Amino acid sequence: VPRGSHMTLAKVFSQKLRELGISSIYIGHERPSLQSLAIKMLLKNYGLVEERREGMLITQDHGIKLISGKGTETSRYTFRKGGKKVSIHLPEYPKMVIDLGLFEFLNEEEKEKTLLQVDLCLSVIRKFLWDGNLTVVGKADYVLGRANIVQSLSLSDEDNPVILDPYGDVVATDQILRDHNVFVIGGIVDKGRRLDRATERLALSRGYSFPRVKIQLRGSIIGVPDEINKILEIILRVKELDQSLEEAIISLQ
């Protein structure tokens, strides 16, 4: 599941490394992606250790060389367990919002599925961004890593949301997804539309209306996942991997 050249978390991590003059890192067995390395440093107690090493050039990610094993490249910093953290400016955008305002209107099968799907969204977000870009709204009691849990949607001047809905009137294109920075996935209800109830309460109260977008494959909902965690990964494959919407949908089968 290969990396993008321009991942948000990678951008901010490399900003910081250039600031420190570090243009090369020995990564050992780690995945050659600054986004994955960021995740390990933030969550799993990894950091940098000063040491000279030589290795082969695996990849170069926003101008930072990632090397391992043996070869002619030099590094002065080595990524490993228990090394020093560096501070990165964690990205606000994009924001993924799961809207569980509908939870109590759901039957028992729908609840069980939903909770699993939402749980799995933590692993999805850790693949492309990190926990803090995921928000769950409408169940104040939910816990999910370092994801933001809020009873109600608190919404800023700069949020530019689109709601994912199979019964939306706008067809999704890579263009429309590129132009939004906030995505709201509710739960399927009455085996029909995808209901974002907490977001709806806020919108109805303030006279906002957010575009509602259906994802199609070749002019149709045939082939397109209805799992929350897979919708999420589609969005992120388009936004962070510059993958086309069509190929993003194929990837999730």
Side-chain angles (χ1 to χ4, degrees), residues 35-48:
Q35 187 277 337
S36 318
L37 301 172
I39 281 298
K40 289 226 170 174
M41 184 173 240
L42 296 164
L43 290 178
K44 310 264 145 89
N45 192 40
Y46 281 80
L48 296 177

Side-chain angles (χ1 to χ4, degrees), residues 31-158:
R31 263 211 39 191
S33 162
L34 290 165
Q35 187 277 337
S36 318
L37 301 172
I39 281 298
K40 289 226 170 174
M41 184 173 240
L42 296 164
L43 290 178
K44 310 264 145 89
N45 192 40
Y46 281 80
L48 296 177
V49 182
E50 237 213 307
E51 55 171 48
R52 187 196 269 279
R53 297 290 292 275
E54 279 71 48
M56 195 205 171
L57 172 55
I58 308 310
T59 198
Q60 182 175 316
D61 191 346
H62 291 75
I64 311 294
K65 289 182 211 298
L66 314 181
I67 73 189
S68 43
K70 247 40 172 174
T72 55
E73 296 295 317
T74 277
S75 48
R76 304 310 223 122
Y77 291 91
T78 286
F79 195 83
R80 87 161 60 108
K81 189 98 213 192
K84 316 150 195 294
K85 308 322 178 75
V86 294
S87 285
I88 61 199
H89 196 131
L90 298 166
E92 220 195 319
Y93 294 109
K95 294 184 188 158
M96 306 294 135
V97 179
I98 314 302
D99 186 326
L100 292 199
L102 89 176
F103 195 72
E104 289 179 317
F105 312 153
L106 292 179
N107 70 25
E108 299 185 335
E109 290 83 357
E110 286 157 353
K111 287 173 162 172
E112 193 176 350
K113 261 169 76 117
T114 298
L115 291 181
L116 173 59
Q117 290 181 2
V118 176
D119 284 3
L120 292 178
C121 288
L122 186 60
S123 281
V124 184
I125 200 74
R126 280 178 187 176
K127 286 172 166 48
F128 300 83
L129 291 167
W130 89 292
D131 293 29
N133 294 273
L134 189 69
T135 289
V136 181
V137 47
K139 273 187 114 297
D141 50 350
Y142 210 93
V143 188
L144 194 69
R146 291 218 215 129
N148 302 112
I149 315 303
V150 281
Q151 176 58 65
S152 11
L153 195 53
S154 163
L155 179 90
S156 91
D157 271 323
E158 216 166 359

